[PDB]
Amino acid sequence: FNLDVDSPAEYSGPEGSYFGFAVDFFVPSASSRMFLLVGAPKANTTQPGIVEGGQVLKCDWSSTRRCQPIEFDATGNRDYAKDDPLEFKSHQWFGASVRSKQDKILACAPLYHWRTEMKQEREPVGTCFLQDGTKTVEYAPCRSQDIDADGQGFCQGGFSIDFTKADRVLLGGPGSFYWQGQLISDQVAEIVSKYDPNVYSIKYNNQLATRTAQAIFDDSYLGYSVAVGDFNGDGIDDFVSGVPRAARTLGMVYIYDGKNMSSLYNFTGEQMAAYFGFSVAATDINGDDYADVFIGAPLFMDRGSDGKLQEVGQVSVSLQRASGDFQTTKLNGFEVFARFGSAIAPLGDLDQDGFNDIAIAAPYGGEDKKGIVYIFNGRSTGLNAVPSQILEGQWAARSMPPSFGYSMKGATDIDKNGYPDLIVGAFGVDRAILYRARPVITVNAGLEVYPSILNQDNKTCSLPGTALKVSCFNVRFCLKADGKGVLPRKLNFQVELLLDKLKQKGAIRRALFLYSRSPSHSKNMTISRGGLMQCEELIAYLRDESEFRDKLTPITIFMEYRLDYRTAADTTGLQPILNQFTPANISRQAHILLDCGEDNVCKPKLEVSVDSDQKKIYIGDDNPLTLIVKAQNQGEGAYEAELIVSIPLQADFIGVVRNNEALARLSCAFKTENQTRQVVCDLGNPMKAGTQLLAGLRFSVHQQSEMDTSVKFDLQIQSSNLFDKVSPVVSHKVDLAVLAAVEIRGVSSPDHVFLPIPNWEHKENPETEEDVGPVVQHIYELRNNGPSSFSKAMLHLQWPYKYNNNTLLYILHYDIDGPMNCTSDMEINPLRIKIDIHTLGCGVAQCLKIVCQVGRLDRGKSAILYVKSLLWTETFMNKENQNHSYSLKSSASFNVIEFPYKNLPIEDITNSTLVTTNVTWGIQ
Amino acid sequence: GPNICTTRGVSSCQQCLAVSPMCAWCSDEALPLGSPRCDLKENLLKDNCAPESIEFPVSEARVLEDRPLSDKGSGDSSQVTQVSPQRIALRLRPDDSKNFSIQVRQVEDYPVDIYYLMDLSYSMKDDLWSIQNLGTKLATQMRKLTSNLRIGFGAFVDKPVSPYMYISPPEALENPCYDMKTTCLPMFGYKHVLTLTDQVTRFNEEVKKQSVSRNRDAPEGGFDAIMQATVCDEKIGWRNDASHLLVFTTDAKTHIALDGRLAGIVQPNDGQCHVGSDNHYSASTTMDYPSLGLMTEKLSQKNINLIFAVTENVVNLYQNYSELIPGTTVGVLSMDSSNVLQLIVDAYGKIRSKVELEVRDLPEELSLSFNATCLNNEVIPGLKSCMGLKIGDTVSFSIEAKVRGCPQEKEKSFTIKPVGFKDSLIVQVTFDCDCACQAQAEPNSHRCNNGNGTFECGVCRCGPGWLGSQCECSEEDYRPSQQDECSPREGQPVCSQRGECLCGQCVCHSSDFGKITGKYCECDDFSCVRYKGEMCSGHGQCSCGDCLCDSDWTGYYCNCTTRTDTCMSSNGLLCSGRGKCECGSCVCIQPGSYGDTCEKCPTCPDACTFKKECVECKKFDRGALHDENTCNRYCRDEIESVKELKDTGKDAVNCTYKNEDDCVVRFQYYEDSSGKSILYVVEEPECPKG
Amino acid sequence: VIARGDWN
């Protein structure tokens, strides 16, 4: 919010050169000056026979805003033979990526081509150039004896680059090993010391590089984007790389260790083709000293209000914790086809709030596709999801979209003003813009009145231009301001005072200032910093009883300050802005003395009553809790009376009671202040004597951890009166009840078997299921529905194994879904295997018991037992009465033996059900 | 007996006309002092006020054009009408809604356009077997469903630039195969070969000439071709009032958007027609592959149905790709399959098996609700879609048009459309807000006392600090002139507290959170119910302590949704048929079913039990799917009588049951083949003996 | 059976 859009720095390169495609700050150690680095990949060069070689220009901020090209090479194409170019620098896109650490500058040309040493080719290996202060070395790790598509030939190394704290260069490219992509890390010292101009392929010691993998990973494009940060215990920056086409185009983000190239963590997009990992960033947003991961997916399609897909874009915010497990949120774009996650730039810290901030750009968004950049401030809870500032660059599209954003660099202070600033390149219009951060001022106003309670009959002082005596109070307002960084030692505020703001409007004003004889007064102030508010003084008076009527409505003193901004430090001019969240005004109230008794002071008697409504709320659900409040004043008038309701933790305020006509409609608002959660309701100003109000308050309680027993609500009344200003605090609690609805269900597949079985041949020693009978499957499910969970439960299955020495249902195998272990009192599948109406229950038949131990079933969970058995055919027919109808009956019961909630009343939960398989003859 | 219209509609005709749509207004001057001038209609007739001076605009929706539907898709019909009505004039007073209806039918014998997009990259050299015949075979299939069929095609390889194209030897150009010693053809991004024509003879003699080309990288970027075949109407030759089918064939995966950056291409697809007289894609080298969103937009606008015909290896990919592009279906291209004949027919049949309503250019404050009648007066609420339709079927939709306040815009017209069809329902929208007495309101502030006021039709109001019948009071010192209507009772306090009241009309606000309005200033305009942490969930406006919801949102707290899309099961049926969709979440009602879409039902009647009713109504013309006439709809499965046996096959499940005739019927159904789920019923069920 | 890029 503190970025200056009034007068930024506009830099412009040659047309069609894609000036601004890449940007970074240049901060030399040998100079106090700082510069801008701007890439121009399509720019034309002085290099012989080279068309659009590309440039990296050094732009001076101090004077004239001039830009000069840095000369890395200036050499044309080298030769393999008489006429046999060894390299092709035409349209090599040099300057497509630019990174600068201290006095080091790294610029790459991803479209640079080779032919290698063997065949005659053109292979986009890519090349970079490292230049420190004088000497310039070429760095091309993808250029080597490993070639073509199978090798590093098409790598296009230098597509993305970054520096570490240890002076290691992180260089990826997408085209390695049939576009699997790879990352290559080398120490800067190695790159400089090992450079031989006569050696086209240089082996670097201590080179950290990924290597080819299975062809399944082809066309993943690893190294599309890169970022650095340390996500393990060590102090060395580790490697973060976007790989947008991976995971069958779902997209991924790889994190590799900084010491060795071993993998650490992974990320995966939830939507295909969204190009998850198009851009990546590493910063600590929550100030926890643990770096957090930002992942762009500009093509992500979310659901509109109508439910139809729309292209917006999404940024994945992943917060690192001490354990290594990430807490990830998601931030959706706004405009369609804006490509919201295209560029993510750490601003390290913009407003000096103590927490780092960040910038996300949607290059094709904004008004008429001119581009837009969003600024997101960081907080202790992580990133603030609401952008505090919008940057919309104004440039007209001519040849192509004037992409604004798509390249950004923050986290450097070029003005030395104490605040970091931001570069945003637009390569469509071939331009780069430097936005400078305004200083932030935190100002605390204050106001009070002497005396607050006005006695209309007390005339003691006045001199209103040769006139009578009037009742006069005093208005004292205090103003202090401080800040950080560069900003002057004295500021000019313009304060405005308004008397009786409640009714000054279209009606009579009941208070005027003494000397001014006016309801309003203006003052030009001047303050200092560090503290100790400078206070002015003014005296106002009250009209006599005759001039007006109403003695009730409070007199509201309204103070408002301006702070006309003139501060420069002569740098252009730069005006500081006040703290984002801060009140431009403060108000106090005065009251005319009415019915205060013989004591000439009001002493209220305040009482607060509350009833139970629901005596029990259930620990797993969201409970419609409604408190019936009785507030009464049995004493004198209470000025600015309020009902203070303290709701701890779980409870959140819904609203007042609209439906009931016997309950008050009183306006209430939820406040969070001084690390407290409260809801305050107006009891009236004043709250008159004998007043008795009745109003309900609806709340929703979820739970806090477990074993919490009851939950508290604290109620009291407060007012502005000097004596007896409060009611005695009355606390009311409601007990947490444990209620879990648990049912058991079952089925038989099939639920019936028709005899005779088709193609039935009996063998004394059955090898397979085919030789035994059809497959009868019983399924039992124990599901917890009711809000409360349970920690442990027992499940007993009674099965009809045999009837008179003859097998009925022969159990083959049984499977379990959910948190359950099971055991059979008999051995299942002992013979192994390969591939009129009479009920037979476990009572009349030999029983096979299956005992299961169940545990931790929550509200939305459940446990299932699948029993796969064969119908024994040999038993049926024979002398068994042959044609006849049997219903095979198995039963299952469950008992819940305990709950996770301790010291709460718990009733024993039990129930049972049965599953019947009816086997009968149809031709009977 | 005061009411809503009386209190809020005091000041002016406009403030009256928008309170509730039932409110009316009165001209006159005759003189109803007290007994408010607004009220409603016949109740305003307590005092006569009979002449047109009374203002009571009535919201209406009238059909401007409705043509009858069409039985056939031939030419001698006046035109082809698949949608009735066509034009509807909608007039709305503020905060009011009228509901209209629309019928949609897919007519039989509807003309079909088919444009083939072929992948000529070297990976497809093996797959060129299926491209032979075609337009002759294309006739032998589509002849059943259509006459006046029109076909044609075009080809794509990939972007003719590095590092897609082999540039390395000079002989690699014009001959992409030099290494490996063979003959390919020079690669091309996209080229239009044969425009849509009724000649299948020319078609076959064209495709035969087509040969394979070669590029370096596996993703072939056919999405460029899909874009150009869509946005270019004249080149392809698409016919309006015809079914548009774009069939896409390839050997491997594809280039998506942003892939072109490796080639040094940063310019996004503009979705224009870049195909010139040379019949090549010109911007192929100069601009990026199109995003799914863009090609979704353009496919919908041109009413073109995209069809993916792909090899068995990559078929799983494009299926998942198709889920992001609604209205598109995928099918398997292989030598063992129903191949190209059924595939196109089955696809077109699957495309015509669904009806959903598009909405174009809908105004902001306007909102639409949809009840859908699909199967014999069933009336499914909250749904714009119809599942499991044949060709020739007709469906109905009832639509409520709700407006919140008034835009004071002149006129705007929007469109209601079946997906992928030219036939449209166009709704012209007008808003009645300004009263008919707006004309001759007098030029200036006069006619009351002196000036500084205005004149409107009943009052003339007054300026800043006059505000009276005629100009009076207001900043004077007011004696207790009267208690008049400053409270809706005697002992009741001054107007809604809030800065009290003086001399009739109340002065109330300053205030805090913004304006306080009303007769008694009882309307909050800020204070309102909250769901979680937020007023009206942020999804609705707060008017006089009441939540007026934004479009697609409903409910007292405005936390309820009109979206059924999150309630849609993988099978395509709402809540898996096992439940009802409410507030964007399925509520399951069934014998113990659960899950988001109610897809999970571990204990349920299995298999045959559900398909028993299907074979009973279809094959035996019998109970309980016969009675509700849902048989031809709810059973889409293909049932075939098999002879006295079922061969032991691949994975399958046998089923058995007794019918009303006490006979034993045996049948089986295949699980997944093409997803067909074919039924096999054994002829000669087992019956008793005599 | 085994190949990569555009080829088979």
Ligand SMILES: *[C@@H]1O[C@H](CO)[C@@H](O[C@@H]2O[C@H](CO)[C@@H](O[C@@H]3O[C@H](CO[C@@H]4O[C@H](CO)[C@@H](O[C@H]5O[C@H](CO)[C@@H](O)[C@H](O)[C@@H]5O)[C@H](O)[C@@H]4O)[C@@H](O)[C@H](O[C@H]4O[C@H](CO)[C@@H](O)[C@H](O)[C@@H]4O)[C@@H]3O)[C@H](O)[C@H]2NC(C)=O)[C@H](O)[C@H]1NC(C)=O
């Ligand atoms: C984030 O996501 C990343 C991407 O998904 C994950 O990276 C992936 O991790 C996989 C598991 O670590 C890894 O699979 C391993 O691959 C190596 C490669 O070595 C090979 O050596 C062979 C000889 O040169 C060649 O392949 C042979 O084997 C394959 C069968 O796999 C045959 O089909 C071939 O014909 C050939 O004979 C290759 O040239 C390659 O150089 C293997 O050595 C590993 O073997 C180990 O696992 C097997 C499991 O069965 C064990 O039996 C065995 O004893 C070894 O312990 C793995 O197969 C992927 O290559 C790798 N992919 C990429 C792109 O990095 C990453 O792990 C993940 N991180 C996190 C934190 O989640």
Ligand SMILES: *[C@@H]1O[C@H](CO)[C@@H](O[C@@H]2O[C@H](CO)[C@@H](O[C@@H]3O[C@H](CO)[C@@H](O)[C@H](O[C@H]4O[C@H](CO)[C@@H](O)[C@H](O)[C@@H]4O)[C@@H]3O)[C@H](O)[C@H]2NC(C)=O)[C@H](O)[C@H]1NC(C)=O
């Ligand atoms: C850097 O410099 C290079 C050259 O040193 C420059 O590239 C050249 O640009 C010119 C024009 O800007 C190109 O000339 C064109 O060539 C094509 C065929 O290749 C023609 O079709 C074009 O025809 C146009 O001009 C005609 C006559 O004026 C018109 O009648 C017609 O309608 C067209 O408008 C035109 O002649 C030239 O081919 C390139 N050279 C290359 C690409 O090698 C590049 O633009 C410079 N870049 C920057 C950033 O300064």
Ligand SMILES: *[C@@H]1O[C@H](CO)[C@@H](O[C@@H]2O[C@H](CO)[C@@H](O[C@@H]3O[C@H](CO)[C@@H](O)[C@H](O[C@H]4O[C@H](CO)[C@@H](O)[C@H](O)[C@@H]4O)[C@@H]3O)[C@H](O)[C@H]2NC(C)=O)[C@H](O)[C@H]1NC(C)=O
């Ligand atoms: C009738 O009305 C008159 C005014 O119209 C009123 O006289 C006022 O009395 C109050 C208090 O009785 C005066 O305010 C105080 O004045 C004393 C003078 O020594 C100060 O010490 C007080 O200090 C305040 O400010 C300090 C800041 O450092 C605070 O720390 C401290 O807590 C105090 O808040 C305070 O200024 C007021 O000045 C006079 N008014 C005038 C014009 O002098 C009189 O009291 C009324 N009659 C009755 C019976 O009350």
Ligand SMILES: *[C@@H]1O[C@H](CO)[C@@H](O[C@@H]2O[C@H](CO)[C@@H](O[C@@H]3O[C@H](CO)[C@@H](O)[C@H](O)[C@@H]3O)[C@H](O)[C@H]2NC(C)=O)[C@H](O)[C@H]1NC(C)=O
């Ligand atoms: C929108 O918000 C309302 C209220 O803010 C939500 O309604 C609340 O939750 C349920 C939903 O009907 C109401 O019933 C309560 O839940 C239990 C669940 O077992 C039910 O059995 C009881 O009858 C119990 O009353 C609840 O009363 C209601 N709360 C209030 C304060 O009204 C609603 O669910 C929200 N809808 C969406 C889509 O977010």
Ligand SMILES: *[C@@H]1O[C@H](CO)[C@@H](O[C@@H]2O[C@H](CO)[C@@H](O)[C@H](O)[C@H]2NC(C)=O)[C@H](O)[C@H]1NC(C)=O
């Ligand atoms: C790569 O570096 C890691 C350190 O980041 C090392 O991994 C260690 O591997 C040994 C077993 O070989 C474990 O006992 C250690 O706990 C690992 N260190 C960790 C997890 O921090 C090792 O230097 C390299 N990795 C491997 C697998 O050798």
Ligand SMILES: *[C@@H]1O[C@H](CO)[C@@H](O[C@@H]2O[C@H](CO)[C@@H](O)[C@H](O)[C@H]2NC(C)=O)[C@H](O)[C@H]1NC(C)=O
């Ligand atoms: C005085 O300050 C308040 C805030 O301290 C401002 O009034 C509005 O306050 C609400 C939140 O309480 C904001 O949402 C509004 O944007 C504020 N209004 C404006 C115009 O900024 C405002 O600074 C001042 N308000 C008055 C009535 O003087």
Ligand SMILES: *[C@@H]1O[C@H](CO)[C@@H](O[C@@H]2O[C@H](CO)[C@@H](O)[C@H](O)[C@H]2NC(C)=O)[C@H](O)[C@H]1NC(C)=O
């Ligand atoms: C066991 O489960 C049954 C349902 O399976 C429940 O009892 C039902 O509801 C009431 C009890 O509140 C009974 O009067 C009904 O007859 C039962 N409904 C049925 C059987 O369909 C309850 O959860 C448990 N009941 C007992 C007796 O243990």
Ligand SMILES: *[C@@H]1O[C@H](CO)[C@@H](O[C@@H]2O[C@H](CO)[C@@H](O)[C@H](O)[C@H]2NC(C)=O)[C@H](O)[C@H]1NC(C)=O
């Ligand atoms: C769709 O059908 C529903 C059925 O309830 C209609 O809802 C009407 O309005 C409320 C909401 O339930 C009820 O009080 C009415 O009784 C309903 N009208 C009936 C049942 O006739 C809704 O208006 C319909 N919408 C459309 C566009 O047809």
Ligand SMILES: *[C@@H]1O[C@H](CO)[C@@H](O)[C@H](O)[C@H]1NC(C)=O
């Ligand atoms: C405050 O400064 C402005 C600057 O123009 C001036 O006009 C104004 O008069 C000053 N205030 C007073 C009270 O003089």
Ligand SMILES: *[C@@H]1O[C@H](CO)[C@@H](O)[C@H](O)[C@H]1NC(C)=O
């Ligand atoms: C909370 O209130 C106390 C006084 O009740 C005061 O110290 C300050 O406003 C807050 N204290 C802290 C420690 O935040």
Ligand SMILES: *[C@@H]1O[C@H](CO)[C@@H](O)[C@H](O)[C@H]1NC(C)=O
């Ligand atoms: C099941 O047994 C495993 C292995 O001992 C154990 O870890 C798990 O806690 C058991 N679960 C239950 C519900 O008994």
Ligand SMILES: *[C@@H]1O[C@H](CO)[C@@H](O)[C@H](O)[C@H]1NC(C)=O
């Ligand atoms: C709304 O209800 C049905 C919807 O089909 C329609 O027949 C009826 O005429 C409509 N009523 C009004 C008042 O618009």
Ligand SMILES: *[C@@H]1O[C@H](CO)[C@@H](O)[C@H](O)[C@H]1NC(C)=O
């Ligand atoms: C396709 O998507 C489904 C879920 O929608 C997923 O389970 C599957 O792995 C995906 N397969 C491919 C090839 O994309």
Ligand SMILES: [Mn+2]
């Ligand atoms: Mn590390």
Ligand SMILES: [Mn+2]
């Ligand atoms: Mn962090």
Ligand SMILES: [Mn+2]
């Ligand atoms: Mn910050």
